[PDB]
Amino acid sequence: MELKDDDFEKISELGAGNGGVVFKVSHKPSGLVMARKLIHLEIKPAIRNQIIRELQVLHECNSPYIVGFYGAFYSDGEISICMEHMDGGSLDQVLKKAGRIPEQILGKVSIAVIKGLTYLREKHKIMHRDVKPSNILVNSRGEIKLCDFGVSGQLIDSMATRSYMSPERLQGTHYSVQSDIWSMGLSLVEMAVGRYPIPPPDAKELELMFPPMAIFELLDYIVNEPPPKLPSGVFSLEFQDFVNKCLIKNPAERADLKQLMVHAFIKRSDAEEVDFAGWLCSTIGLN
Numbered sequence: 067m068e069l070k071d072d073d074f075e076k077i078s079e080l081g082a083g084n085g086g087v088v089f090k091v092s093h094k095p096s097g098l099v100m101a102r103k104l105i106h107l108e109i110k111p112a113i114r115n116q117i118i119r120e121l122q123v124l125h126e127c128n129s130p131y132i133v134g135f136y137g138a139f140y141s142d143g144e145i146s147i148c149m150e151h152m153d154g155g156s157l158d159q160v161l162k163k164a165g166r167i168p169e170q171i172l173g174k175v176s177i178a179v180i181k182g183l184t185y186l187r188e189k190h191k192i193m194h195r196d197v198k199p200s201n202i203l204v205n206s207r208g209e210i211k212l213c214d215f216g217v218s219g220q221l222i223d224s225m226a227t228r229s230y231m232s233p234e235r236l237q238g239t240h241y242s243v244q245s246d247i248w249s250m251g252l253s254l255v256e257m258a259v260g261r262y263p264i265p266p267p268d269a270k271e272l273e274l275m276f277p278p279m280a281i282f283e284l285l286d287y288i289v290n291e292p293p294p295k296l297p298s299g300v301f302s303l304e305f306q307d308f309v310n311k312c313l314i315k316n317p318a319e320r321a322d323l324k325q326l327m328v329h330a331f332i333k334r335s336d337a338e339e340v341d342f343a344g345w346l347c348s349t350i351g352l353n
């Protein structure tokens with residue numbers, strides 16, 4: 067779509083991350099309601115246009131598992147990324163309201179994430195690079211979609227508490243789409259237990275549900291300690307095994323997207339009848 071600053075009317079604020087703010091907006095010429103992300107950057111015209119050009123690939127993304135893109139442009143010190151408005155927000159904010167997300171929901175999320183990453187790899191040769199609950203969006207039609215993947219290397223460079231980065235990435239060695247699987251595994255543990263799971267919950271913390279760690283200490287924990295795991299009574303063995311295969315520290319032994327698609331947890335989840343829309347609407351108070 068052709069998009070420019072004066073096309074838009076602000077409706078409300080959707081949220082803010084470290085270096086961006088997202089607004090629900092009306093696109094007057096089309097009538098479309100969008101989510102417009104504004105990334106404030108101080109960069110010269112050559113860099114701005116390289117970011118915008120790199121983002122044009124997003125017009126080619128078309129999947130039920132990937133948030134739709136309408137367009138990108140630069141205005142007043144900010145790159146705008148206009149995308150599909152997801153009325154359920156992110157799984158991060160869903161997690162806050164829900165406390166914990168149950169296994170059968172997380173099964174539908176797992177399927178959507180695997181298929182989204184498969185689509186990005188197979189059709190666009192893109193790894194995601196930033197899988198985490200805040201980058202998985204949901205809506206009241208019960209859809210689950212990935213956003214904020216690294217289509218633009220220049221946007222990544224111009225922008226550079228919780229870390230979702232795999233051991234291999236944190237140690238500065240080789241990484242691939244396998245590092246996204248790690249991020250998914252960790253995201254799933256977080257949502258399953260209701261807390262970012264590094265360091266592991268002990269005895270009395272698991273009891274209640276069923277000092278914080280500095281960034282350098284956290285990173286060295288991820289690289290050197292055994293991977294997080296689900297508690298073993300409350301979740302099915304298939305779910306525990308699924309998460310375990312995602313969180314293998316050696317990326318060559320960690321399951322890949324093709325193996326996950328065929329995992330027992332995934333086969334079972336795919337056959338289950340889960341009214342996700344109904345669950346979502348009542349947990350966050352939508353219509």
Ligand SMILES: Nc1ncnc2c1ncn2[C@@H]1O[C@H](COP(=O)(O)OP(=O)(O)OP(=O)(O)O)[C@@H](O)[C@H]1O
Pocket residue numbers: 080081082083084085086087088101133149150151152153155156158159200201203213214
């Ligand atoms: N397309 C969308 N529809 C609805 N809400 C959205 C959409 N895109 C983003 N949001 C909301 O806007 C908020 C800010 O998003 P943003 O990507 O800037 O930050 P983040 O992913 O939460 O954090 P970080 O900066 O740590 O990566 C998110 O919490 C998300 O809930």
Ligand SMILES: O=C(NOC[C@H](O)CO)c1ccc(F)c(F)c1Nc1ccc(I)cc1F
Pocket residue numbers: 082083084085086087103105121124132133134135147149196212213214215216217218219221222
């Ligand atoms: O927005 C991104 N993530 O970071 C969030 C910041 O922390 C804002 O606070 C981001 C980073 C690199 C890149 F290449 C992109 F295309 C990004 N955005 C992005 C990608 C796909 C869709 I569909 C919609 C989008 F917006």
Ligand SMILES: [Mg+2]
Pocket residue numbers: 083200201214
């Ligand atoms: Mg985000």
